[PDB]
């Protein structure tokens, strides 16, 4: 009876349970821990709590759960805190406390369970209690007591799809482990009643797992050994955690968890590939257009144009503002979105820069062209160079509807139009660019390229 | 050749579209016509003949001197010539604010720091108390008398093939004051105020044609005429100022639309076309089916962008709100492959009787919603009521409009051109198979997916 | 020595008071009962029996214990204020406390009455707000120890035994800071007499750990044994970061409570038999014909309640004459030094309806589709705003202030009180006779040369 | 004799004296009311009291003046108050508390004669008592009342040079007349003796003067007439004063004298005086956060919230988007614009930059932050140093809701933070910079301020 039930402990404690942030578990009341996968989907218990270690289950109630307190040769410990929140709603804002999850940029902040009807102070409820003497251990200036700190494990309730139909009870999702970065005193009302009740907001900073989004649960099955120490537990935990106990409050900026939208393009892959005819044609067009940076504009005016029409949507070229100088914007637009008499008009503000191809963009001068977007209107940035990470960076965290042109989109949208209509003769092009073609400014308001 | 070639002037209509880039040189002739690509403002002005010498046009205020008639004295007309643009860098608060599609200009005064005493002891300023009095109306007697102000703005051209900087200008209209103000401005050159004069004009609708007919000016400064005499070439919309007054301004105003207004006729399908009898059906059907119709709008929406070729993408609904309208996201791809940006789409649909057209405020609950980077949709069998359209092309609403004729158009060939059956499983597919696809996900996140 | 035994237990044991509690308020009570009938004893909390302190007195209006005599200074524990807001739709003083506790705003008018003689104030009570805004603004953190802590109550109607019942209970509404105190003048609608006093505006302070107070502190403060800066160890964290900081520490420090924004039909209107609700009766069954003379009076309206901040406005005009269209009147808001201030354009709609119906979100977006960047909106009207609008207001963060109908005929009520004497008639007059000179057919953008 | 001095009086009635704001006065307390033109300036005491009328004159001592109740049939009434302004520093201001002229936008900040060494409540003094008692009618709840109510004629000493040497003293200079807009409490410190005392703070509304820029003073002539009643003394007011009498508080933001001048100031205009104590305090900031960036980032959001504190909106304390690093965003705020009942939140973005005070911040800097902004958010950017010309006429033309705050207006704002809070130490401020600027980082949404 010894031998078997060692030996499964020590066959689960041999494979790796890994788990992601977005799995989607079924959590079924009253369910085995044998199941690997329950009902199409990854059983909860058994990922928490598999039947070869021995160990009862991790309960995962609306709002703060923790098993019993280990006790060990090292110390009184707290194994891990569960976390689950629910999103439908029935309210005004729905809640002013709503609990709000930025995963995208590593950051969730969560309410307490402290009820109107609880009688007494933040906190006699359970819940609120674990995150207090959990708090104190994340606030902790020692590896002592970083430690000693309880993963906050993340799960969101989900509504679940199969054949027909939509199931919104029985599944949770996977949301990461947090750090408790600070702690609060909040008071709510209870419109039930209409009488205000104390409680606590947690501002959390979800971990990234290295390197691939996700969190070996085998960790759990440390943190919940009571022969184990509070260091002997940092074999199967995520790298930036261990760097957490190991650092402090200082390293997580750094091993905050971070996603973007789309993907994100170096300056060597932004740039044509090296030693091909599209670079030497990048420097030739460097070269060419260092002297006057007009015809350089009107040349990127009908660039754009043809990136716009090589999708298939309609586009209309407008104009260029100035004749001499600088500004933020250098050339007008239009695009007609949906079909023919009823699409609907959307301005194209335009700028040009010609630069070395191995430079890049900064962000402010990006923005210097944002700022003048107003609504229904996007933006087009043209240079010969490349874009820097954080212009993309930017652009993409802060949803910027602004369409980059750097040097190997530039050099294949001029080639195809050297091939169109300008039968292989590139200094045709570049010439009628610079004489007669730039004098043509029109001189009129942005949103006036509607009218025409 | 006297009074016969005047009489031949008279003739001869001189129609100036509002817009019309005009040459004005200095020692212009006032016969000929078209001067280096234009048409020459003198001669514009005074073509020559009448015995009238030419109504200059120099820099700010203008006019001719004062008409003697068989009864009372007159003002002929009044010139003002303005001149954009810095080049990027609109110094003045003082400066001429021009909205000729709503038919309204702010203009400024000419009086000067160096100017002593109050405005107007520089004459422009004085011409525009004396005309702004007789603008002032009361009587018709008194409107009938008060000069016309016609409005002009010097343009940078292209002379036949290169441009050209000065010595050209544009008609903007004629224009009813509305309003005059004292206002003290500070020379930013010296840096000490001055007072001068603010105008509120209104320019009129020109009606048949958006320009002017410039015998009005003639008849203006035909001695032999009267006031009464001189209305036959002039634009309905004075007349009618003359006639009522200062309450007639709104009606008489110049209001351009960038767009055209459709009527419900034409939002629909044809009277006995069989696409129609479709629409009648999807009417019949979702008639107590808001989420059906809704997603069914999320498709077709989804379809009417795809098919221009534009790389566009669904994504769900929006029924969780909280006692909120339903509401489809989708996402487009703007511009070449790999070199593009996601776009969101916020639509709403609303299921109406084909007869039946759509508020503003409706449309103005997607128009809302709508963050920077984001487009909208509306989707309905009925029509859209011609206010919510202006709204839309006047304040520039990024909101595509689906009507019953566009609805049932795409819907008809969006069957039996890939379905390989017909509509009632369709209609059966926006309820069963449709079910709920809505989640509880804001709209910026079909970019990030 | 003897009795120092019940006053080391009033020194050891923590004696909290939370905002909202429910305070049984009597004047011949003893200061020995923690509870009496009911509920808890208000001259215990402030004053108990084993200290040996006087009752601290809560009359009507402003209330502060002798001053007391310190080892250092002369200073004055307390202020303890009585409020009676009473009604749900008000009295008939336009000039009547308002609170806003969930944001920790309080609108508290000095006791200045129409028979006093002078200027404000010569009643103790604005007399004792003006020595205390001495010290609310001390220009150094000795100054702002000195500062005696404004306690603000509440008279109320508690649910008891006998079917519930009015009279004799006090809320304890937290501790405030005195942001600021002008000059008012006040209009009796009864006697009709016209007096000035003062309006202050009060930051009730966050309570940090727990929502209240310890009544220790007033104890300490009470100590005339005790420096100020002994007396903190019982403050709060929000008045602790106060004293050091000063003004700096307002923004950060007010008490926040997080609750629905939604408000019911019932709130947004006067209430059955009020002032406030004939004043609306009188409104729409005015305005009802004429949309127009409503915009402007609506102009008015929203040009009085972003003045009551203190703000800049500067009004603007009415966009047409006759018909309809988005947007009714536009005015401006600048925002920054007197020097380099940037507008903000304000867009105003107006709409005349029952004071029963509501405003649909459609029609309010009507209004905030128009709003550009950097620009707000401002919904004027007799009736009240849909549960749904307000619920897309908050969700899609719509910046437009809703004024209804409780709103539209308190201020009115006021601008009548204060400018035409309590004539209603000559206001409205005033509206249908000026709407139309006051109309230009200028962009939004341009009121930025005004 | 009596022919003489009646039709002396009545030719005085019959004849306009209009002085415009900007008028430069010769003002000499021994000076005659015949002579009209006195060394080389208009007399003011003829101006204001011709010796046709026979009363007597109206002096104008440093502060506020007021001449004796005139005893009309109607009743008594108050003629006028008027003040006198001292300063001109020209940027030497070492006194916070300085009254501010901002007639372009018809405004002025003034203060009453309480000293440090005044024994009472604001104001046992004769000045804040007649500013008090002219309140009292300036909010006059009647159209009778706010007849009653005493003008305020605005007057500033100041230097004249018409012949080429510059007069300190003997001249001073209209202003126009005002109506209290507000009149509030408020406590200063003399940075000299540096005790610390109330006083009377008030907003004053510089009123239209219509179709002339400035006031006919024959409106004060019958005002001073004993035998005119108080309501046909308007016969010579302003348009806005008549206005004003019969709406009240309604006229007051739409009668504000408006002067159209160019909103772009240069770097020189930005920047506080050579020579001055602001100066100085400019150079301890810069010198100070020449190294801190986050530190600079909590002040600039505490200067911010003072300026948007004057401005009369209500502010609220967010949080600094970062501790360590850089960005688009520095510090997060909000601003409840409305009532108290009635109001919105506006979400306010904030950027530091502490740069040469020579040094002007380009207009890619500004949009970097400006770029960021919904609708319903404002945005405000503090530098030591100035803004280029370019960056201010692109935030003007596309109307960019944006507060600039150059090195000037940081440098007052702080010495008056300084004088009022921390009694002259600077260094307790700066500290406090420096120590509190690690607490007061959060990973939060800028939307979540509504929360707070
Ligand atoms: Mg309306
Ligand atoms: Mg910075």
Not at 417 to 429: P, T
Request: with cysteine.
């Amino acid at each position: 009876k010894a031998d078997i039930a060692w030996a499964a402990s020590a066959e689960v404690a041999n494979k790796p349970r890994l788990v992601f942030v977005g799995d989607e578990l079924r959590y079924a009341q009253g369910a085995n821990q044998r199941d690997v996968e329950l009902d199409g989907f990854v059983n909860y218990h058994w990922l928490t709590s598999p039947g070869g270690l021995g160990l009862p289950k991790v309960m995962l109630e609306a709002g703060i759960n923790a098993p019993a307190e280990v006790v060990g040769p090292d110390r009184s410990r707290r194994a891990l805190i569960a976390i689950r929140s629910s999103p439908w709603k029935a309210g005004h804002e729905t809640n002013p406390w709503h609990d709000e999850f930025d995963l995208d940029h590593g950051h969730v902040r969560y309410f307490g369970d402290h009820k109107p009807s609880t009688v007494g102070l933040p906190g006699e409820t359970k819940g609120n209690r674990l995150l207090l003497e959990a708090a104190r251990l994340h606030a902790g200036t020692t590896r002592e007591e970083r430690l000693l700190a309880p993963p906050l494990f993340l799960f969101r309730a989900v509504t679940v799809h199969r054949a027909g139909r939509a199931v919104v009870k029985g599944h949770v999702e996977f949301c990461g482990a947090a750090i408790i970065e600070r702690l609060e005193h909040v008071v709510q009302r209870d419109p039930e009643t209409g009488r205000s009740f104390p409680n606590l907001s947690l501002d959390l900073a979800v971990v990234s797992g290295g390197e691939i989004d996700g969190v070996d649960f085998r960790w759990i099955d440390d943190r919940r050994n009571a022969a184990l120490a509070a260091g002997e537990t940092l074999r199967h935990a995520p790298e930036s955690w261990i760097r957490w106990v190991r650092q402090g409050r200082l390293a997580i900026p750094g091993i905050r968890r971070r996603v973007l939208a789309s993907a994100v393009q170096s300056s060597k892959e932004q740039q044509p590939a090296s030693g091909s005819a599209e670079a030497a044609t990048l420097q030739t067009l460097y070269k060419f257009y260092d002297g006057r940076k007009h015809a350089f504009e009107l040349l990127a005016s009908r660039v754009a144009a043809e990136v716009f029409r090589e999708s298939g949507a309609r586009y209309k070229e407008g104009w260029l503002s100035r004749s001499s100088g600088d500004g933020g914007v250098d050339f007008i637009g239009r695009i007609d979105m949906g079909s023919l008499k009823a699409s609907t008009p959307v301005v194209v503000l335009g700028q040009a820069k010609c630069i070395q191809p191995t430079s890049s963009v900064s962000p402010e001068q990006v923005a210097r062209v944002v700022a003048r977007l107003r609504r229904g209107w996007i933006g087009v940035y043209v240079t010969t160079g490349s874009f820097s990470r954080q212009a993309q960076v930017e652009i993409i965290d802060d949803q910027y509807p602004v369409v980059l042109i750097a040097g190997g989109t530039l050099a294949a949208t001029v080639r195809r139009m050297v091939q169109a209509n300008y039968g292989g003769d590139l200094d045709a092009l570049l010439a009628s660019t610079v004489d007669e073609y730039g004098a043509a400014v029109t001189h009129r308001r942005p949103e006036e390229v509607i009218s025409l």
